[PDB]
Amino acid sequence: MIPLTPLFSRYKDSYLLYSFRLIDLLRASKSTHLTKLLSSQATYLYHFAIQKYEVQQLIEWAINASPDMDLQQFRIEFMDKTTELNLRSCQPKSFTYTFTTIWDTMHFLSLIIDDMVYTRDSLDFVMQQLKTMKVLFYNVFFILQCAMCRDHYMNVKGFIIYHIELIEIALDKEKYGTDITFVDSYQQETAGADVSNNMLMKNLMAYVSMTFHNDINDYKWIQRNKKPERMTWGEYKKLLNL
């Protein structure tokens, strides 16, 4: 499926760390609503990482874990519990949690979307996975503390979700007889809509999340009142072997 590269290996570990830090919040949840949101998100996260059954036991354990433990103690009991559930594949290699962990996670999910679409057949299955992807991007938690970031993301996250919906639309047209034409550039996709073609950019969500990532970093100069090395699509594809 997705090319194995150094950068993808980091994405994968960051993804697991993100998921670990999410289930640690369950014991602390101050509402039923938050508990249901976290539980579903973490279940979805491991889904994209028998396995469904073991994950359910892991999440249920996380739900009942003592609220009076610290993170470091939760981490100990989590490494034991994942080992006992034969879920060693859920254990992160590193636990240093930063903005990069969150970015890696979003870029990881984007790669998963692109891969599911490229290797589809079952279009109902992929259309259901996409809806789950929309829920995941809608409900990204920062876990770390940055209110400004949370405010900014809640304003512009629809940019990513919108593009997931474009893929749904493409798959719907394919179900009804117009196959997907994969194109090399975003410009072919956006221009093609301005008219019975069904053109979709290859690696669309890699590009979408890369451009979104650049925009966030450009905007923070406005946020700090300061004068401004941005990632290019050419070098991003190279780093990930796309």
Ligand X SMILES: Cc1cc2nc3c(=O)[nH]c(=O)nc-3n(C[C@H](O)[C@H](O)[C@H](O)COP(=O)(O)OP(=O)(O)OC[C@H]3O[C@@H](n4cnc5c(N)ncnc54)[C@H](O)[C@@H]3O)c2cc1C
Residues that bind ligand X (CB under 6 A): 99-100, 102-103, 107, 148-149, 152-153, 210, 213-214, 216-217, 220, 223, 231, 236
- Closest separation between CB of residue 75 and ligand X, Å? 22
Q: What's the min distance (Å) between Cβ of 225 and ligand X? A: 12
Separation CA 18–CA 15 (nearest Å): 5
Q: Distances from the Cα of 224 to the Cαs of 30, 79, 178, 218, in angstroms? A: 33, 40, 48, 11
Least gap, CB of 19 to ligand X (angstroms): 15
Closer residue to a copy of itself in complex, CB, 147/195 = 195
Q: How many CA atoms lie within 13 A of 132 on its CB side?
A: 19
> CB of 91 within 8 A of CB of 50?
no
Whose Cβ is closer to a copy of itself: residue 27's or residue 152's?
152
Cβ 210 to ligand X, closest distance in Å?
A: 4
Residue 147 Cβ vs ligand X, minimum distance, rounded to whole Å: 9
Which of ligand X, a copy of itself, none does 242 bind, CB closer than 5 to 8 A by kind? Answer: none
**Which partner, ligand X, a copy of itself, none, binds residue 69 by CB below 5 to 8 Å per kind?**
none
Q: Which is nearer to ligand X, 27 or 192 (CB)?
A: 192
How many whole angstroms separate alpha carbon 115 and alpha carbon 110? 9
Q: Work out the end-to-end distance of the chain between its first and last CA atoms, rounded to an integer number of angstroms.
A: 11
Nearer to a copy of itself, 10 or 173 (CB): 173
CA distance 112 to 49: 9
Binding site partner of 168, from a copy of itself, ligand X, none, Cβ cut-off 5-8 A by kind:
a copy of itself
d(CA 87, CA 172): 36
Pick what 213 binds: ligand X, a copy of itself, none; C-beta below 5 to 8 Å, kind-dependent: ligand X
Work out what residue 100 binds among a copy of itself, ligand X, none; the CB cut-off runs from 5 to 8 Å by kind.
ligand X
**Residue ranges binding a copy of itself (CB under 8 A):** 127, 134, 138, 155-162, 165-166, 168-169, 172, 176, 185-187, 190-191, 193-195, 211-212, 214-215, 218-219, 221-222, 227-228, 230, 232-234
In the complex, minimum distance from the CB of residue 193 to a copy of itself, in angstroms, rounded to a whole number? 7
